Design a protein around this ligand. Sequence first.
Ligand SMILES: *[C@@H]1O[C@H](CO)[C@@H](O)[C@H](O)[C@H]1NC(C)=O
Ligand SMILES: [Cu+2]
Length: 235
Amino acid sequence: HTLVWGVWVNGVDQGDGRNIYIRSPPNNNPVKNLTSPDMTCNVDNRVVPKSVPVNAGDTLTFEWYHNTRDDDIIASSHHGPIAVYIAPAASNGQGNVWVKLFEDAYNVTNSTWAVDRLITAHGQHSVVVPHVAPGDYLFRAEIIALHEADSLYSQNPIRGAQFYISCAQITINSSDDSTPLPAGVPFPGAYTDSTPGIQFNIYTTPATSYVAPPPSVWSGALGGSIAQVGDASLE
Ligand SMILES: *[C@@H]1O[C@H](CO)[C@@H](O)[C@H](O)[C@H]1NC(C)=O
Ligand SMILES: [Cu+2]
């Protein structure tokens, strides 16, 4: 159970984004139905009033929280991967529009899932804004918690992979458009019952055999990190 509080640009807190530039759901409950429209931007997908201005090559940091800002972030049990996608805002998340910028599942060195490192990072993970056309975009941050993913939700609705989905409204002002955005995948639709990484037993299978759901990271992505970029407690 986790939600996004807001974003930082180049290490500067943009302020409380909930229902302002984040299409916030009413609570931190997971989405589980792979075929639901809730898979796009969670249960309350509507235009919110602000869009955060960035430039190509900026560091965009998402900040997650559980109940209050800079708390335990997410229950330790919720081991799983983190991905970020982008789509043109015009689409409203509909159609074959989502392009993946970031994937982090399991770091073999540190023996930590992306979620374990997100807790240590005080809920902060970043992407570098790609060189796409100037304009209005949705950034979709997605956490998959795998602690009950041995079962499919489609067969046992008590269990299943849990999706924590947040869409931020981002405006890209300055860009050389050297990597125009290609066509992407649909949400709902990209993940099905047979997609790798949706059904997985974290208790019995070693984390090193985990494969994150496709699609793969676009070659125009400039990377990202799970790491604290600012101290929320200095505000
Ligand atoms: C999944 O959501 C779809 C689309 O709204 C709906 O048809 C179906 O009833 C849901 N499945 C379950 C298992 O609730
Ligand atoms: Cu939870």
